[PDB]
Design a protein around this ligand. Structure first.
Ligand SMILES: CCCCCCCCCCCCCCCCCC(=O)OC[C@H](COP(=O)([O-])OCC[N+](C)(C)C)OC(=O)CCCCCCCCCCCCCCCCC
Ligand SMILES: CCCCCCCCCCCCCCCCCC(=O)OC[C@H](COP(=O)([O-])OCC[N+](C)(C)C)OC(=O)CCCCCCCCCCCCCCCCC
Ligand SMILES: CCCCCCCCCCCCCCCCCC(=O)OC[C@H](COP(=O)(O)OCCN)OC(=O)CCCCCCCCCCCCCCCCC
Ligand SMILES: CCCCCCCCCCCCCCCCCC(=O)OC[C@H](COP(=O)(O)OCCN)OC(=O)CCCCCCCCCCCCCCCCC
Ligand SMILES: CCCCCCCCCCCCCCCCCC(=O)OC[C@H](COP(=O)(O)OCCN)OC(=O)CCCCCCCCCCCCCCCCC
Ligand SMILES: CCCCCCCCCCCCCCCCCC(=O)OC[C@H](COP(=O)(O)OCCN)OC(=O)CCCCCCCCCCCCCCCCC
Ligand SMILES: *P(=O)(O)OCC(C)(C)[C@H](O)C(=O)NCCC(=O)NCCSC(=O)CCCCCCCCCCCCC
Ligand code: SF4
Ligand code: SF4
Lengths: 60, 39, 122, 185, 49, 80, 332, 334, 77
């Protein structure tokens, strides 16, 4: 015979746009995530510099 | 939804621990990798 | 003018008086441009030698007595002038116009019957 | 612009929306701008490809796929007895779109209709298969070979000796390719 | 290709042929391979018609 | 002026298309007296334009048909 | 003359040879078999994808986006295999001829096309992941190379260069040829007439081409692929070696060629780069009296001054790429 | 001391400079392989085992290629620009601490030394475009000089914010001051701006008009043959590695981690290397991921987005430091 | 002799290892030439990098039909 489609017909294939949204790129959790790192970092930086400042007192 | 199942797309699939890793990390688990099946 | 540097809109001549002005205008632009043509294509000839070629080109068509044919020759002259003054031609194109720079010479036809016959149709 | 008849339904776009009327919150709008969300998403796509198998094959140790129809280096073929298949019909010389074939012929010493010159200018040939399609005896064929780049252009002027030697070397491929595709020819 | 003048055309110049090309190739009387050909000459150190 | 004429002789006498030198006058014509056809005249005005380093418009060039006409024309032009 | 058409728009070979086959078929006054119509429509949309893969991605690579060009040219490799399976060439197939197609497709091709079809949507989507929302891509294309709908018609713009300016017009819809009247598809149309709209139309044309190919796979009928008159199409090789009539017709078609009734026709198709047309004059003999090719890229590049005057030199690469420009088309 | 000072300086210089050039050579090999894996391909795998000799083949090919200089404008001036660019691109490695004080020059003004040598490197690019005697390539080299100075302002503005936290220009002290916290957390917007500025400062994509050949007027670096190409390319990879090292120093804690002298030194070197390598990977990652920004847009990004934010941060940060009594001491400590 | 062959091997290994063509992609052959840089064949794996200007290039690949109008440009590069 000849190259023919299957008797049922080939199943439908994906062609419509599929770029689904994901939570890893929504800005609201990203903004919350960035704020926490900055807040945590400044908490550690206040404690760090205050300690460093006390070390200069002892050294002097 | 727009996407067809990865289980119907004529491309090499992942298996075992690596398929669970793939479904947990990629942007869309239904997206194929474009590698054709040799059989 | 408007489309590109030396672009001349195609127009018919109204009469023989109109045509003669264009022909003299075309010759004037050509022999005026001869100094620039030399230095622009680094031609190994003096402007005198180049300007003689301009006159001979205009003298091949001196005997034309048909107005439509003149319009065709005028359009060709403008097209050649534009593609020369714009650096669209290359040195190979302009140099090929000087018949002396062919390795078989400029007298590319036999002088008389017996020279062509002895060499074999030229 | 639009086809004749009444304007297509809803062809006219609605009026533009002002900044005030945009249905998207400021925090989302400011966040995408400063965080570059769609650029981050595009970068994440590359990492997904970074862990997918590459498509590269290691040529010349591996080769890409070719079909029985593949049109490569020309060859002249024989019968199983070893007689030339070519009978100087000149069909391939006439159909050739590039005039790449030159043929001369007379009666052979035994009186057989055979060629004396069979040249193919491989620098004129457009590799279209028309000669192979026109040949009534399967004499001229294109082999699957494509790796015959040469040092000089003169090496690409094939005469009858070069073409018959090519057919002798490539015959099992030539018969296999003919075997697979002859039903469709 | 044909040498036909269009009056009122701005910038009627060649579009396909080489600069300084002589003849109109789509005329039936123009031969297929034309009249001339080029090559590089090692004395002139340039291309020659 | 007179300085222009002494420069005018420097090119017309050097021109190889003159019927006979010393035929030049203060009012000689290129065609009638000097035996110049149309294009030889076009060339002479172009040689004068080079000497005074001033471009001559085509209409102005058509007006110039005599040695005096050129001497008058160059004086009117500021450049020289 | 048919192989001369492969080499005009030399990333769109089968549709180039399609337009010359349709014009010659029109003067021949023959209706090609239904299977040939579906094969040619199927390969038409495969060739449209091959062209858009070359056009869109190399246009993306010109403005700095290296990666999509690499991804999509593996897709080109897969579809070039289909061209080599049917003919024996990666590019210049000489496959679509007046009367239909050269030979039938091998018995395992439809399923291999189908397998590629199940994964091609993801390839389109991943391309859109890098460009469509990317703010550098948008800032390089939006408001660049604008032409109004009125001027696009007066400049001879066709295809995407016309549909990007809002004009709904496709030759496959307005004057259907082959099997495009038997398939369903949508026509992407822009509204701002800029490089960004024309990019979005071409990305959607990817999806409609795949949508047509899937329909052609299921609607493929049985039967011959060459018109069944050996006075026009060559007989099967087994017929040529078997009966007198077939051998004569084989001899004459490959030495003299078929005679085409005298007359002239302008035939146009929706090529991947826009309206491709051919104007053929037949004198009744076996050689065409005149063949003139209407290349969409010729009209588009003639509009470069109109769309670029007054604009930035740094936008010229954007509009050179927005015109689908192959200079085999332009110069011929 | 124990042995000769000259011997120590020889060995210390050789230990920093020689392994640096090895690392710069393999950043070019890694760039090709990383973009290839991202592009579903292999990248160099045939010149040497696993492609590990590719950069040495490239360098030797170019070093034995013939140079085509300008129309005898000047011999000295033609090479003058390339020489300056390479020397000052490499001079900044001399203050990098591979451990506390483990630098060729442990300088108290080290940050200002790095800024100075970068400013002197822009001369070579500008002096090259002019020397080429091509007004087309000069404008591209002029645009490239404008981009380099403008984003130099972005980097020195970002760096000023880090100095306010540590109170010192010593690279060692900056690193020690991060045992409290890596500055990427408190100065997260600054780190992002500084990394973007470092990409622009290196003429790297998406800021890569200097080498772009598809853009009609761009591609100034594309006319550099033989030795001149080697000079410019080595200087660029050398600056890429140094901008990644300085980024790790300022924001990722430098050589800090996450009894024998040899192993302590090795771990400090390794930790700095791991952090630098990650930023080199991101550096390659962005070239492969984005299209190219137009010159007018990249200048507007610098002057209307990055700088106005940085000058706003220059006001806010010291006010926060004063309000929390965290203005650091500026004496020799750490 | 052996020394001069060693430099011969070394200098030739560098010429082979970094093979930089200036693709004068005149026509449809440039499409096949462009497919050598794509993932299936990945010329970069062997050290081949395409170069836009002749100044940076070692090899000229004439991939296309050379017209008379184009020949002066090809000779120039
Ligand atoms: C130089 C600085 C080296 C710093 C540390 C580099 C670590 C990686 C070393 C890579 C080189 C290993 C040896 C090698 O592959 O050479 C293969 C070479 C051959 O190169 P090749 O290009 O012919 O490799 C063929 C293998 N294929 C083609 C499949 C990939 O063999 C030799 O001749 C080696 C002897 C001379 C070695 C000169 C380079 C040594 C560099 C390290 C010292
Ligand atoms: C910075 C300046 C540029 C870099 C200069 C130094 C570069 C690093 C060392 C590279 C040495 C050359 C590569 C190693 C030798 C080699 O080519 O091996 C393959 C060679 C053959 O090279 P080949 O070119 O004939 O092999 C071809 C490989 N394929 C088929 C893939 C194309 O092996 C030999 O048969 C001869 C070996 C000669 C002796 C070894 C020479 C080593 C010299 C080390 C110098 C170190 C300084
Ligand atoms: C690491 C890779 C994570 C891959 C898995 C993932 O995508 O997680 C995304 C996470 C959950 O989102 P998800 O529900 O999966 O998406 C909607 C699906 N219907 O979405 C998330 O919540 C994670 C994204 C927010 C992370 C915040 C903490 C980091 C903040 C860094 C700020 C950087 C600023 C620059
Ligand atoms: C570039 C980036 C620029 C933008 C930065 C954006 C974020 C800025 C956030 C600033 C927050 C500062 C950190 C607050 C803090 O750490 O307070 C610490 C202090 C107590 O800490 P302390 O006693 O020193 O030691 C730890 C005891 N377990 O607590 C106190 O005693 C004082 C707390 C005062 C709180 C004022 C409001 C804070 C918000
Ligand atoms: C540079 C670094 C990034 C700085 C920006 C990131 C932080 C963004 C904070 C969110 C901005 C908007 C906040 C807000 O209150 O929005 C509400 C108001 C309009 O409300 P809306 O969301 O449109 O209502 C829903 C309609 N769909 O929108 C408004 O009226 C605008 C109010 C702006 C107030 C901003 C206060 C936060 C400033 C954060 C500075 C961060 C400093 C550290 C870095
Ligand atoms: C290492 C760790 C990860 C590093 C991540 C690096 C991310 C990739 C960096 C690549 C280079 C940055 C690309 C920036 C692209 C760009 O310049 O876009 C220009 C854009 C134009 O916006 P504008 O002119 O202001 O007007 C908008 C109205 N249409 O202007 C903008 O879009 C500006 C918005 C971005 C601002 C970022 C700087 C602020 C950072 C947080 C504070
Ligand atoms: P005078 O009375 O001597 O002559 C006046 C004219 C010429 C008008 C005649 O008397 C006359 O009646 N002629 C009849 C009509 C006529 O003039 N024909 C038109 C001819 S136009 C013409 O010949 C244009 C040719 C231009 C060629 C220029 C040189 C070639 C180009 C290359 C330049 C050198 C290399 C860069
Ligand atoms: S090769 Fe075949 S077609 Fe050509 S002359 Fe021989 S028999 Fe005839
Ligand atoms: S393949 Fe085509 S061009 Fe080449 S010889 Fe055969 S018919 Fe002629």
């Amino acid at each position: 015979p000849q190259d023919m489609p299957p008797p049922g017909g080939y199943e439908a294939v994906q062609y419509k746009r599929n770029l689904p949204s994901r939570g890893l790129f929504r800005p609201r959790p990203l903004l919350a995530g960035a704020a926490v790192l900055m807040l945590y970092g400044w908490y550690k930086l206040v404690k760090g510099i205050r300690e460093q400042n006390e070390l200069a007192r002892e050294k002097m | 939804s727009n996407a067809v199942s990865i289980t119907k797309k004529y491309t090499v699939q992942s298996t075992g621990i690596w398929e669970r890793i793939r479904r947990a990390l990629v942007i869309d688990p239904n997206r194929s990798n474009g590698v054709p099946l040799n059989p | 003018v408007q489309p590109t540097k030396f672009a001349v809109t195609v127009r018919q001549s109204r009469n023989w008086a109109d045509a003669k002005q264009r022909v003299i205008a075309a010759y004037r632009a050509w022999i005026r441009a001869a100094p620039e043509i030399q230095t622009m294509y680094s031609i190994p000839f003096p402007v005198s030698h180049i300007r003689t070629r301009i006159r001979q080109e205009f003298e091949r068509h001196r005997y034309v007595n048909k107005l439509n044919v003149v319009d065709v020759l005028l359009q060709q002259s403008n097209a050649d002038f534009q593609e020369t003054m714009n650096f669209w031609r290359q040195q190979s194109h302009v140099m090929a116009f000087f018949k002396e720079e062919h390795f078989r010479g400029e007298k590319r036809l036999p002088s008389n019957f017996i020279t062509g016959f002895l060499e074999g149709r030229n | 612009a639009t086809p004749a008849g009444p304007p297509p339904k809803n062809f006219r776009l609605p009026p533009p929306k002002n900044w005030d009327e945009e249905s998207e919150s400021t925090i989302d709008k400011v966040g995408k701008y400063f965080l570059m969300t769609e650029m981050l998403r595009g970068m994440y796509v590359l990492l997904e490809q970074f862990f997918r198998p590459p498509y590269t094959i290691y040529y010349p140790f591996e080769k890409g796929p070719i079909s029985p129809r593949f049109r490569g280096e020309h060859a002249l073929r024989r019968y199983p007895s070893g007689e030339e298949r070519c009978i100087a019909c000149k069909l391939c010389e006439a159909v050739c779109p590039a005039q790449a074939i030159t043929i001369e012929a007379e009666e052979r010493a035994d009186g057989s209709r055979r060629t004396t010159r069979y040249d193919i200018d491989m620098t004129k040939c457009i590799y279209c298969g028309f000669c192979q399609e026109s040949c009534p005896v399967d004499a001229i064929v294109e082999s699957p070979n494509a790796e015959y780049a040469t040092e000089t252009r003169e090496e690409l002027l094939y005469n009858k000796e070069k073409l018959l030697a090519n057919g002798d070397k490539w015959e099992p491929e030539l018969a296999a390719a003919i075997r697979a595709d002859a039903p469709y020819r | 290709m044909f040498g036909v003048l269009f009056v009122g055309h701005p910038d009627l110049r060649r579009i396909m042929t080489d600069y300084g090309f002589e003849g109109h190739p789509l005329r039936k009387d123009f031969p297929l391979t034309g009249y001339t050909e080029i090559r590089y000459d090692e004395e002139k150190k340039r291309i020659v018609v | 002026k007179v300085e222009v004429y002494e420069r005018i002789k420097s090119l017309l006498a050097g021109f190889d298309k003159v019927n006979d030198p010393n035929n030049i006058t203060e009012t000689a014509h290129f065609a009638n007296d000097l035996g110049l056809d149309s294009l030889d005249t076009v060339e002479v005005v172009m040689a004068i334009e080079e000497e005074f380093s001033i471009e001559i418009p085509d209409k102005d060039a058509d007006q110039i048909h005599s040695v005096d006409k050129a001497i008058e024309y160059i004086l009117r032009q500021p450049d020289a | 003359a048919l192989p001369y058409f492969d080499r005009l728009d030399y990333v769109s070979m089968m549709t180039n040879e399609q337009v010359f086959s349709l014009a010659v078929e029109k003067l021949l006054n023959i209706e090609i078999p239904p299977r040939a119509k579906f094969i040619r429509t199927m390969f038409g949309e495969i060739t449209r994808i091959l062209n858009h893969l070359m056009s869109v991605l190399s246009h993306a690579m010109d403005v700095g986006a290296l990666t999509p060009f690499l991804w999509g040219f593996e897709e080109r490799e897969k579809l070039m295999e289909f061209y080599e399976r049917v003919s024996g060439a990666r590019l210049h197939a000489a496959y679509v001829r007046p009367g239909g197609v050269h030979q039938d497709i091998p018995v395992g091709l439809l399923d291999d096309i189908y397998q590629w079809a199940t994964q091609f949507g993801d390839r389109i989507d991943e391309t859109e992941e890098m460009l469509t929302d990317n703010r550098i891509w948008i800032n390089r294309l939006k408001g660049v190379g604008v032409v109004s709908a009125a001027d696009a018609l007066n400049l001879s713009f066709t295809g995407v260069m016309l549909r990007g300016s809002g004009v709904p017009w496709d030759v496959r819809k307005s004057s259907p040829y082959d099997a495009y009247d038997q398939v369903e598809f949508d026509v992407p149309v822009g509204i701002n007439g800029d490089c960004y709209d024309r990019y979005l139309c071409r990305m959607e044309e990817f999806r409609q081409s795949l949508r047509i190919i899937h329909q052609c796979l299921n609607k493929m009928p049985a039967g011959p692929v060459r018109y069944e008159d050996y006075k026009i199409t060559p007989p099967p090789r087994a017929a040529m070696k078997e009966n007198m009539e077939a051998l004569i017709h084989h001899f004459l078609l490959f030495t003299k060629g078929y005679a085409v009734p005298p007359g002239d026709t302008y035939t146009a198709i929706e090529a991947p780069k826009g309206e491709m047309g051919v104007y053929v004059v037949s004198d009744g003999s076996e050689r065409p009296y005149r063949v003139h090719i209407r290349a969409p890229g010729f009209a588009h590049l003639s509009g470069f001054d109109h769309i670029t005057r007054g604009h930035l030199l740094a936008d010229a690469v954007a509009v050179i790429g927005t015109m689908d420009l192959v200079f085999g088309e332009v110069d011929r | 001391m124990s042995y000769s000072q000259t011997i120590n300086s020889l060995v210390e210089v050789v230990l920093v400079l020689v392994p640096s050039l090895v690392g710069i050579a393999y950043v070019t090999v890694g760039e090709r392989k990383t973009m290839g894996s991202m592009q579903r391909r292999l990248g160099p795998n045939a010149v040497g085992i696993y492609g590990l000799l590719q950069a040495f083949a490239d360098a030797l090919k170019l070093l034995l290629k013939e140079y085509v200089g300008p129309t005898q404008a000047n011999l000295v001036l033609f090479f003058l620009g390339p020489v300056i660019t390479l020397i000052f691109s490499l001079l900044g490695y001399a203050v990098i601490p591979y451990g506390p004080g483990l630098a060729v020059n442990d300088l108290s003004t080290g940050i200002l030394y790095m800024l100075a040598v970068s400013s002197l490197a822009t001369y070579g690019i500008l002096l090259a475009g002019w020397s080429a005697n091509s007004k087309y390539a000069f404008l591209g080299s002029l645009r490239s000089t404008a981009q380099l100075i403008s984003y130099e302002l972005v980097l020195s503005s970002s760096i000023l914010l880090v100095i306010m936290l540590s109170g010192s220009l010593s690279l060692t002290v900056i690193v020690e001051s991060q045992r409290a916290i890596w500055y990427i957390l408190p100065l997260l917007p600054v780190f992002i701006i500084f990394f973007i500025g470092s990409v622009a400062e290196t003429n790297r994509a998406p800021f890569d008009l200097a080498e772009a050949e598809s853009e009609l007027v761009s591609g100034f670096m594309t006319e550099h043959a033989a030795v001149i190409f080697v000079f410019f390319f080595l200087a660029e990879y050398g600056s890429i590695v140094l901008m990644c090292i300085l980024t790790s120093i300022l924001f990722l804690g430098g050589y800090l981690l996450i009894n024998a002298p040899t192993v302590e030194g090795s771990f400090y070197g390794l930790s700095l290397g791991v952090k630098t390598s990650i930023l080199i990977f991101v550096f390659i990652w962005t070239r492969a991921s984005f299209p190219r920004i137009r010159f007018d847009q990249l200048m507007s990004f610098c002057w209307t987005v990055l700088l106005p934010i940085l000058f706003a941060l220059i006001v806010l940060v010291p006010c926060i430091l004063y309000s929390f009594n965290i203005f650091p001491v500026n004496i020799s400590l750490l | 002799q052996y020394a001069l062959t060693t430099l011969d091997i070394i200098t030739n290994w560098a010429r082979q290892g970094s093979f930089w063509p200036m693709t004068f992609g005149l026509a449809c052959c440039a499409v096949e030439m462009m497919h050598l840089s794509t993932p299936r064949y990945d010329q970069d794996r062997l050290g081949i990098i395409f170069r836009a200007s002749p100044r940076q290039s070692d090899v000229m690949i004439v991939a296309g039909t050379l017209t008379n109008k184009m020949a002066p440009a090809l000779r120039q590069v």
